[PDB]
Amino acid sequence: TGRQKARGAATRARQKQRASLETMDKAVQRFRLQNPDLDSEALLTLPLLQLVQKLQSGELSPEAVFFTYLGKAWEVNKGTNCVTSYLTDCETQLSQAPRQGLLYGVPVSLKECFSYKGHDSTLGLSLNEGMPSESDCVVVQVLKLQGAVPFVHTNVPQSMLSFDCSNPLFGQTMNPWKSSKSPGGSSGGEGALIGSGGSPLGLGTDIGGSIRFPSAFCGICGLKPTGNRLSKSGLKGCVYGQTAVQLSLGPMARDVESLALCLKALLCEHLFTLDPTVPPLPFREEVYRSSRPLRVGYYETDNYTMPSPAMRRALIETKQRLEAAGHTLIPFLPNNIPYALEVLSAGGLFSDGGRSFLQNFKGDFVDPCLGDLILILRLPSWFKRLLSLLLKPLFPRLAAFLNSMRPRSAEKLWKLQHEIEMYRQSVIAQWKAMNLDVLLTPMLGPALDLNTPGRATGAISYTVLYNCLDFPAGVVPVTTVTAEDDAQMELYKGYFGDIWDIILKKAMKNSVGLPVAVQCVALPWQEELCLRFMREVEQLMTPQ
Amino acid sequence: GRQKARGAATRARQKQRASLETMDKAVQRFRLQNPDLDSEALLTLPLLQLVQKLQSGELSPEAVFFTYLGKAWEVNKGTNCVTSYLTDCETQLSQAPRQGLLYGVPVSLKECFSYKGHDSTLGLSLNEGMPSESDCVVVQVLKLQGAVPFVHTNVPQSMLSFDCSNPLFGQTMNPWKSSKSPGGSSGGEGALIGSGGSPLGLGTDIGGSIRFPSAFCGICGLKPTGNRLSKSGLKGCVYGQTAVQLSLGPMARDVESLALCLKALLCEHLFTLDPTVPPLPFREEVYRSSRPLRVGYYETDNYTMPSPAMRRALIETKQRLEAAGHTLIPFLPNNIPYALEVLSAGGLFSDGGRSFLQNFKGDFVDPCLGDLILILRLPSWFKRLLSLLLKPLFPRLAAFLNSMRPRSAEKLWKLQHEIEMYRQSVIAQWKAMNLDVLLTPMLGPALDLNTPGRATGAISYTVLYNCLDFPAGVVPVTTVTAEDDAQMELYKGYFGDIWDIILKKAMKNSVGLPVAVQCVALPWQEELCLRFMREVEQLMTPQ
Ligand SMILES: C[C@H](C(=O)O)c1ccc2c(c1)[nH]c1ccc(Cl)cc12
Ligand SMILES: C[C@H](C(=O)O)c1ccc2c(c1)[nH]c1ccc(Cl)cc12
Ligand SMILES: *C(=O)NC1CCCCC1
Ligand SMILES: *C(=O)NC1CCCCC1
Ligand SMILES: [Cl-]
């Protein structure tokens, strides 16, 4: 535990970030000089579908779209620190973008863990600094074959096991709505950047909420597909081979139609031939565009994380609008939530007591946004056990988590994997007994204060459940925190009254004006229906 | 502590006996009322023409059902393939959806497909008297398509075996030759279908278990990608093991029957009964394509020396495919020994066999399992020491033994990641040669009863494709000639270990037995695997 390697890694990373920003700015200046007459705010505020259509007609050139968004990104980065790297070869890709690509001319931002040839994917960890990828990951190759132009890497919290957004290399990303707030994570850089208008489309990943937290905290749309709907080939992570709780990747954008367009672009022959392990399910457009009324299961609370007044209102309003539009709304709650989170989800993420994950931290600083996670994982199994016994009568949530963070044998992992498998069937059976099409749930919100997500773990209950179940789940911004909702946080107690409830209460205060989302869920492989429902919520709640 | 196990065998034996009595009484009544039915003509109809006549009304479902029931009862006399008669099937028979793609087709089920009110014992006494509360998903889908599941077929005890005997229902025999294994673990299906007792069956395959019995018994079989079909309600020994992928699929007399079965199963009913299965419908245009293929092939995997019959089968098919206009490209997946001894074995036994062993507490161990149970029971440190001792002389045994030790969750994660990088590695190696499909030997001809369990090395041709989770199927293409049999005198093996020695003896005295090749396509590519299989069948067995 000396820190000289970690300091040198930060110095190099900060230099590279600084020089990327300088290059971006030079390129933007050069462009703006050659084109002082371009209506840049008209271009930036076009919805993606309309941007794509003008690109396709020739009305906007790719260059103008690209450098206009580049300047916007450089500008919003000043207040958010969301961009870790400029993807330097993107000006060449711009000139070779295939004219028939579904995303021809579209600049796209990429969460830092998407391998991009020539660039680190540090995950904010010093051991990955100075080790550039030697190829584009598969989805990046597909984006490029669809004529998209990936142009920046966006920040993530250290090792990505977090829903905040700071690391010791690139520092802290900020919510563009309010700089005291987290932009969510681990796809926080994408949320910050997309939520301020600096990118029309990005890709994130999500193993416990990491597409959905930043999309909700920053006021944009996001979808986490079924884990094996899209290729994971070439994604950087901290731990490999953990398959109990399913990692997924997916789009973040300003509206639902953008998510659909991106999935449609990715789910093409190129993807399925580049990674044959992905079932070749094309995008089922007729499901996405369907207009039939739905049977919509819903819940207003999971009884685990007390929803904020603004979350609860967002959900009840959406429900009511969905009723009025003719959908049938049916109360529904997945069975045994506390078991799913405390045993299955926590147990699957940390089946080896965190040993693999800890290896990444050897000799490194631990970013304060992770709170006491590293400290606690380092405890020897017997002491976790003892502490878990001692906390059980006082703080049972904490005790259950702690016990599930213990290493175990492969025999016990199989047993866990089999329980995950039975649990997924138990929820599908509830769903089919009620004959649901989709499921409406609250989504954690408004944005928590910086540095509190790592100290409020129970609050992952709304999202992580669908990584456990491996169901597609998306979020759509539906309202903003009113002063009335905010004042009502003084009455919030949580269901448990433990440290997690106490932190969450304080962290959600001061949020007037912040966006608040609901989550839309469908069955495995039903991304298009999930999106069809999202589009409906978006239309109903935010018609204009 | 075997008294409970004895009781379980007595009860299972009485259920099997009653089942067979029930079947015979129903068959005799039917034959009496239909003395003129041409029962040979019906039994010899390819499944596709049988389906056609059922769909038109030309044959009634009753006629087809009782004729197969009678044939199943008779071939069972010589094979012991049937464990149970699925009693309510006569009622299913009457309500069978007239529009289903399988309307009126009798279908046999390996015993591990749960059927309401029936045990799936897997030959184990702890599962006797534990009847299932409902039909598993694929059985529900088969009935919704108008098929009539009618028997459960035998499997080796626990199913972790490619022979076919257990202490409840006893031993299943190859129908071509009664001293030969029918293969397994889907051996009851191989014996039943390979003798004309059933036109379509479902088996399961974690290391070759659809492919061994189809090859040994001279029928076709397809192991799809592991998650192409629903595994919901399948009975198993060990649950939660997901490194090496279990797959389920059809067995039948011809390729077209496999394709018709896959196409019936891949329908909205399956996709909504089990939403965890990607809803990929059967792509008929892929299956019916007639474009020339780039076909990779090997004659040996350099791990298990092929029998002369296997080698000849492989070369002959290769030559035919060349003469029909396909490009044949030497190709051998890289690092097979690692895939077998480290990935496959470690994947199947990551816990040192602890969970598997719990099924055997208090039970007999069928002889067809060999010393598997004895070896898994050894302390980890002892497995390690023997491994170290065996290594300079017998590296295969040593590597397997080492991989059957219990390991930690952390190490299983590392194994799971190695399996996934190995899979990307072979896929990369396949695309660099621009292969459409791959042709390989398939183990055969059938081994002597009670030798599969002592010749584990012989799993190398099949389990590789469970490890990689590629669709793979088998097609009978030739029969052993007196020349192929005599050349077994010269059989050496690459290792000269005890597995080479057992296998050499086990494959002799086989003149006249069927021998297959194996066809492989990339993941999710069942329709192309089948097109390729249909081509092999058409070129090698034209009439
Ligand atoms: C007690 C400690 C804390 O809340 O400070 C703690 C306990 C559990 C977790 C954590 C931090 N940070 C986490 C992140 C993910 C998961 Cl699954 C569990 C935890
Ligand atoms: C030593 C003993 C034998 O050769 O009979 C043995 C050793 C390994 C295995 C086996 C039997 N039976 C098996 C079945 C599957 C696997 Cl992966 C390994 C084995
Ligand atoms: C992204 O999915 N972030 C997750 C937050 C909860 C624990 C795992 C990581
Ligand atoms: C069927 O898949 N049987 C397998 C044979 C080899 C050992 C695993 C079980
Ligand atoms: Cl899958």
Side-chain angles (χ1 to χ4, degrees):
Chain A
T1 48
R3 292 285 177 261
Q4 220 56 38
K5 157 142 286 271
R7 301 187 206 273
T11 302
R12 283 174 254 131
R14 299 175 199 328
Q15 181 57 51
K16 270 181 253 200
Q17 174 189 38
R18 204 182 291 107
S20 277
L21 297 173
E22 196 47 51
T23 306
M24 276 167 69
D25 190 20
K26 290 188 179 129
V28 172
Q29 293 311 332
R30 175 179 322 121
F31 178 85
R32 275 170 190 171
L33 270 224
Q34 303 149 349
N35 298 280
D37 270 61
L38 206 73
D39 187 358
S40 81
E41 333 213 328
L43 190 160
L44 290 166
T45 62
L46 298 161
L48 182 62
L49 249 229
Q50 289 185 224
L51 189 73
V52 161
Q53 173 224 297
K54 301 185 180 305
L55 277 153
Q56 183 48 232
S57 70
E59 186 192 336
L60 292 173
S61 56
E63 296 75 25
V65 175
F66 176 83
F67 293 108
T68 306
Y69 259 101
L70 203 64
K72 181 62 174 194
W74 178 89
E75 287 158 7
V76 306
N77 184 61
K78 287 216 50 85
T80 53
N81 185 38
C82 53
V83 174
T84 64
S85 188
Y86 176 43
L87 302 176
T88 46
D89 72 18
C90 64
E91 291 174 63
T92 310
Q93 182 53 217
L94 181 66
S95 84
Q96 321 165 169
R99 279 271 354 183
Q100 10 42 70
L102 298 197
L103 296 173
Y104 174 64
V106 179
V108 170
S109 46
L110 295 169
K111 178 174 181 173
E112 204 220 20
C113 55
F114 292 91
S115 298
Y116 191 96
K117 170 154 141 112
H119 290 252
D120 296 350
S121 285
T122 60
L123 318 186
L125 302 147
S126 57
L127 106 163
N128 301 324
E129 199 283 336
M131 316 258 254
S133 290
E134 286 169 10
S135 41
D136 288 357
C137 66
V138 172
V139 285
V140 167
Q141 296 185 52
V142 180
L143 284 174
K144 290 179 161 174
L145 293 161
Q146 288 283 18
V149 197
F151 74 102
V152 280
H153 260 161
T154 60
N155 203 30
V156 301
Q158 197 182 21
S159 79
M160 313 195 291
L161 208 139
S162 162
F163 68 107
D164 210 341
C165 203
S166 182
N167 62 78
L169 302 176
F170 309 104
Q172 179 177 258
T173 301
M174 294 171 286
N175 194 308
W177 290 77
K178 191 176 160 109
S179 66
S180 72
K181 294 297 205 182
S182 170
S186 57
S187 319
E190 287 305 313
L193 174 70
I194 294 164
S196 40
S199 172
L201 175 63
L203 299 186
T205 69
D206 185 310
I207 196 157
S210 282
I211 283 162
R212 295 163 288 159
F213 290 121
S215 290
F217 289 13
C218 298
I220 61 167
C221 300
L223 174 72
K224 174 206 69 66
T226 320
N228 197 28
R229 189 81 199 257
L230 286 175
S231 178
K232 282 184 287 303
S233 170
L235 261 60
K236 178 79 156 255
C238 266
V239 184
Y240 298 101
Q242 186 281 118
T243 57
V245 174
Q246 200 90 348
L247 207 207
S248 176
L249 76 96
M252 295 169 53
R254 291 198 299 270
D255 51 38
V256 173
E257 192 71 49
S258 300
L259 309 183
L261 164 63
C262 179
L263 229 67
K264 181 166 59 159
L266 291 177
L267 289 169
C268 61
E269 267 309 311
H270 299 293
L271 179 85
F272 305 141
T273 78
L274 295 166
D275 184 1
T277 75
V278 176
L281 294 155
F283 186 79
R284 273 178 299 294
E285 196 134 12
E286 72 266 35
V287 169
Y288 167 57
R289 315 228 86 112
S290 157
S291 225
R292 291 189 202 153
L294 294 163
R295 299 177 53 87
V296 178
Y298 77 91
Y299 54 97
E300 182 203 276
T301 170
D302 61 10
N303 298 134
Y304 195 88
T305 293
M306 188 178 283
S308 63
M311 262 161 76
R312 187 170 236 148
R313 186 178 50 84
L315 186 292
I316 283 157
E317 285 181 9
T318 300
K319 174 183 107 51
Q320 287 166 177
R321 293 221 109 93
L322 283 163
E323 272 163 331
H327 299 290
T328 308
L329 278 283
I330 306 131
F332 177 95
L333 185 73
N335 75 85
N336 285 287
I337 289 172
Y339 162 80
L341 303 167
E342 295 168 348
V343 188
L344 302 185
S345 309
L349 290 170
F350 297 111
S351 314
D352 75 346
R355 279 232 320 158
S356 311
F357 171 78
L358 290 160
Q359 283 305 299
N360 297 273
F361 280 90
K362 232 227 281 336
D364 205 345
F365 296 109
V366 179
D367 197 281
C369 91
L370 305 175
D372 293 315
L373 183 61
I374 311 305
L375 192 120
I376 276 154
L377 286 170
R378 275 166 183 167
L379 301 166
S381 182
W382 71 267
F383 189 66
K384 294 174 179 167
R385 180 165 181 273
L386 170 78
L387 209 37
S388 163
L389 294 170
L390 293 185
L391 290 166
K392 185 164 178 189
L394 314 171
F395 307 117
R397 290 208 285 188
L398 340 176
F401 265 85
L402 233 196
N403 183 64
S404 286
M405 285 159 91
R406 292 181 45 227
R408 74 209 69 195
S409 65
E411 180 191 345
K412 295 312 163 157
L413 182 46
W414 283 354
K415 177 199 214 283
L416 177 66
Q417 270 158 189
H418 182 222
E419 290 179 11
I420 284 175
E421 183 204 332
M422 296 299 90
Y423 179 70
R424 189 174 198 211
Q425 294 286 349
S426 75
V427 175
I428 285 162
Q430 289 176 259
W431 181 292
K432 290 279 156 215
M434 215 130 278
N435 198 211
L436 313 182
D437 300 314
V438 298
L439 169 61
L440 177 64
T441 92
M443 169 51 206
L444 184 81
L448 278 64
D449 294 351
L450 295 158
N451 290 313
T452 64
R455 286 173 188 289
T457 290
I460 69 175
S461 57
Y462 286 106
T463 44
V464 76
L465 177 66
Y466 303 101
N467 297 92
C468 185
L469 283 170
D470 194 26
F471 286 11
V475 297
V476 184
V478 299
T479 188
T480 55
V481 180
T482 62
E484 174 187 16
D485 304 322
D486 198 71
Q488 275 160 8
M489 278 306 310
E490 311 298 339
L491 307 209
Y492 178 102
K493 280 178 272 217
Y495 297 118
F496 295 92
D498 58 22
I499 182 62
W500 290 348
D501 285 341
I502 291 161
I503 295 283
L504 196 65
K505 173 180 182 199
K506 191 186 183 312
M508 297 191 285
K509 281 193 186 171
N510 297 105
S511 309
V512 170
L514 297 199
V516 174
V518 296
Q519 173 173 241
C520 309
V521 182
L523 288 172
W525 314 111
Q526 296 310 323
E527 289 74 17
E528 299 99 326
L529 176 54
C530 185
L531 281 165
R532 179 263 179 282
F533 180 39
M534 291 167 71
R535 174 179 56 68
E536 180 90 357
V537 168
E538 181 185 69
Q539 220 279 322
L540 288 177
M541 291 295 288
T542 45
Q544 28 247 334
Chain B
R2 302 290 183 268
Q3 212 51 44
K4 270 273 258 318
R6 294 194 172 100
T10 300
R11 288 182 306 267
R13 277 157 204 184
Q14 287 167 178
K15 290 168 205 177
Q16 160 188 54
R17 223 98 50 191
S19 273
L20 299 169
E21 276 150 15
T22 299
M23 278 167 69
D24 190 39
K25 291 166 211 262
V27 164
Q28 297 299 332
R29 270 176 191 293
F30 175 86
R31 269 175 193 171
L32 229 214
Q33 283 180 301
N34 299 84
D36 296 310
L37 188 63
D38 183 355
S39 85
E40 292 315 321
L42 191 167
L43 290 164
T44 58
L45 286 179
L47 174 65
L48 261 288
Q49 301 168 223
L50 187 73
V51 165
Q52 200 270 131
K53 294 187 180 218
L54 279 157
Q55 197 37 253
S56 79
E58 181 175 339
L59 282 169
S60 63
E62 299 79 46
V64 170
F65 177 79
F66 292 110
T67 309
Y68 264 103
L69 202 65
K71 192 61 172 199
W73 181 93
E74 295 164 8
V75 305
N76 184 64
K77 302 299 276 186
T79 61
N80 185 38
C81 60
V82 167
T83 74
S84 178
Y85 175 45
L86 303 180
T87 39
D88 65 22
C89 62
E90 320 187 14
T91 74
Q92 179 54 36
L93 172 67
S94 94
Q95 308 168 343
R98 230 293 186 185
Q99 266 68 59
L101 301 193
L102 298 164
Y103 170 67
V105 174
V107 170
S108 43
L109 294 174
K110 188 177 178 174
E111 205 224 13
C112 60
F113 295 92
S114 285
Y115 199 93
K116 186 180 175 67
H118 290 249
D119 285 348
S120 289
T121 67
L122 323 178
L124 294 155
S125 47
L126 103 164
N127 295 332
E128 192 287 325
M130 291 303 278
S132 159
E133 214 89 49
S134 50
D135 292 352
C136 56
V137 165
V138 289
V139 164
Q140 290 177 61
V141 172
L142 291 169
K143 297 169 169 184
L144 295 154
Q145 289 282 20
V148 189
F150 74 108
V151 289
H152 263 160
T153 50
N154 201 33
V155 299
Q157 193 177 27
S158 82
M159 299 205 298
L160 195 303
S161 166
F162 65 104
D163 203 351
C164 202
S165 184
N166 65 75
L168 296 182
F169 306 105
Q171 187 177 61
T172 300
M173 286 172 275
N174 190 318
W176 289 82
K177 181 180 249 266
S178 63
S179 65
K180 283 308 183 166
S181 171
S185 58
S186 318
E189 284 312 310
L192 178 71
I193 289 158
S195 49
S198 168
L200 177 64
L202 292 189
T204 70
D205 187 310
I206 195 166
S209 277
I210 278 158
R211 289 164 293 163
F212 292 121
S214 305
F216 292 13
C217 295
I219 62 173
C220 297
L222 170 70
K223 180 205 63 70
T225 318
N227 194 39
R228 192 74 200 255
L229 286 180
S230 167
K231 274 186 284 293
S232 185
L234 261 50
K235 178 78 148 231
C237 259
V238 167
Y239 291 115
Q241 181 288 111
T242 62
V244 185
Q245 279 301 102
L246 178 77
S247 186
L248 79 114
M251 290 170 66
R253 280 184 326 252
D254 58 41
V255 174
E256 194 80 21
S257 296
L258 306 181
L260 166 59
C261 193
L262 208 65
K263 175 169 68 160
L265 295 171
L266 291 163
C267 61
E268 272 304 310
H269 311 286
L270 183 107
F271 298 149
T272 80
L273 289 172
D274 185 358
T276 70
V277 170
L280 295 151
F282 192 84
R283 277 164 288 156
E284 171 102 349
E285 76 281 1
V286 175
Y287 168 66
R288 308 246 74 122
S289 174
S290 63
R291 301 161 272 116
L293 297 167
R294 285 179 60 83
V295 181
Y297 79 94
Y298 46 103
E299 297 181 27
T300 175
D301 63 2
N302 292 149
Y303 196 84
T304 282
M305 171 79 80
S307 64
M310 286 165 66
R311 195 182 316 260
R312 173 172 75 63
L314 185 289
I315 292 172
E316 296 184 11
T317 308
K318 169 226 177 226
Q319 284 167 175
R320 298 265 216 238
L321 289 156
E322 277 172 321
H326 305 293
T327 307
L328 276 279
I329 290 122
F331 178 99
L332 177 67
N334 78 81
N335 286 281
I336 296 175
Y338 165 60
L340 311 173
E341 301 160 357
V342 172
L343 308 176
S344 288
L348 291 167
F349 296 102
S350 318
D351 71 342
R354 273 202 97 233
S355 309
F356 183 74
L357 287 171
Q358 287 332 283
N359 299 273
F360 285 84
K361 274 162 191 198
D363 206 343
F364 302 100
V365 172
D366 196 276
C368 83
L369 298 183
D371 295 305
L372 176 54
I373 277 53
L374 206 123
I375 283 293
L376 289 175
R377 275 178 179 156
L378 301 170
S380 184
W381 64 262
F382 194 57
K383 298 184 172 158
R384 187 179 181 269
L385 167 64
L386 234 37
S387 185
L388 292 151
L389 272 19
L390 281 167
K391 183 166 173 167
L393 303 175
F394 308 111
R396 275 209 283 206
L397 314 175
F400 265 82
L401 213 222
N402 185 241
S403 286
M404 297 149 84
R405 290 168 62 214
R407 78 205 62 193
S408 76
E410 179 184 353
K411 295 288 182 283
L412 183 42
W413 287 350
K414 191 194 150 153
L415 189 63
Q416 269 157 189
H417 188 226
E418 291 185 49
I419 283 160
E420 115 214 336
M421 290 302 91
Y422 180 65
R423 191 177 189 207
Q424 284 302 329
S425 152
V426 176
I427 276 160
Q429 185 195 343
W430 176 303
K431 291 163 108 252
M433 285 297 86
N434 195 212
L435 302 196
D436 291 310
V437 289
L438 175 53
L439 179 63
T440 88
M442 178 44 208
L443 185 84
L447 280 49
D448 295 349
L449 284 170
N450 297 311
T451 63
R454 287 166 185 290
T456 295
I459 70 178
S460 69
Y461 288 102
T462 47
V463 73
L464 173 60
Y465 301 99
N466 301 92
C467 185
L468 289 172
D469 191 25
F470 286 16
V474 298
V475 181
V477 294
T478 192
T479 55
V480 179
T481 63
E483 206 204 342
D484 304 322
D485 217 58
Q487 310 182 39
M488 276 304 311
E489 297 302 327
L490 312 183
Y491 185 92
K492 269 190 194 151
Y494 301 110
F495 292 88
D497 61 24
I498 186 49
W499 297 343
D500 280 341
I501 289 155
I502 297 285
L503 191 69
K504 172 190 153 93
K505 183 190 212 319
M507 298 184 283
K508 294 187 163 158
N509 318 113
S510 309
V511 175
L513 300 195
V515 176
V517 293
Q518 176 172 234
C519 302
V520 182
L522 288 181
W524 310 109
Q525 220 101 110
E526 285 78 14
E527 296 96 339
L528 175 66
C529 189
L530 282 165
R531 123 109 181 114
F532 179 33
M533 281 167 74
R534 164 182 62 73
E535 188 89 10
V536 164
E537 177 185 62
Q538 213 282 309
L539 291 171
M540 291 290 293
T541 39
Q543 257 67 228

